[PDB]
From a paper:
The structure of kUNG in its apo form was solved in two different crystal forms. The disc-shaped structure of the leucine loop extension centred on the side chain of Q212 was not observed in the two unbound kUNG structures. Taken together, the unbound kUNG structures suggest that the leucine loop extension is highly flexible in solution. However, the absence of electron density for the leucine loop insertion in the apo kUNG C2 crystal form, and partial ordering of the leucine loop along with significant crystal contacts in the P21 crystal form indicate that the leucine loop is very likely highly mobile in solution. Mutagenesis suggests a model in which the kUNG loop is pinned outside the DNA-binding cleft until DNA docking promotes rigid structuring of the loop and duplex nucleotide flipping, a novel observation for UNGs.
Numbering used by the authors: 21 to 219, 222 to 255
Amino acid sequence: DDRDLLLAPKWISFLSLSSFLKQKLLSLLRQIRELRLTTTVYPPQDKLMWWSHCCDPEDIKVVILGQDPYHKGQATGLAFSVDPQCQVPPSLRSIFRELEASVPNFSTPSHGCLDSWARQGVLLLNTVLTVEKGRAGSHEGLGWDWFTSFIISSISSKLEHCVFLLWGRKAIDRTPLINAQKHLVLTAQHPSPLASLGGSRWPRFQGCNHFNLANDYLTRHRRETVDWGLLEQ
């Protein structure tokens, strides 16, 4: 039943999943519900699809990929976003600092809630949506990959002139799914300081200027821009 897919209806309609894929997602969600009876899993179950409630698919301007959720209780259902009760972790402090140095109307806030981005059409999507407490990458694998890859392809297939910010080796591995004739892809090193630089090669996060370039791209295709400085507590 569509109730237990946890996705907002405008997304269910936009994704147009088959019966097979809806049953496979329901089994995955039911598997996770049973995992919670032995282990703490972030984020909460009713936040797994939190991104799909903050804006509709037609509102998406920029797609930012995460890895897995934070694993210390600060994950909110949005990639990189922080519960106002927890400290801003190294990744987001590094994002704010690139913004502080490049975008005029940005001032670094004292919090890390990025709900204001999500409403404006910034899709903050973890590539794997659950994580066990205190064990990063514990749910990396084929459990979530088919599902988050399906979302990215649906955004590339059905939308036009969006911006994909790919930071790090795992997000950059999703490059083939994006039609770069319809969409802008911008790649960089992961924002967490001293992250890998390739091995096989990508530019540095510091000075990548991805947020201005995203808006330059949307402006040139006559779409509304993202105001990164708008971050409400």
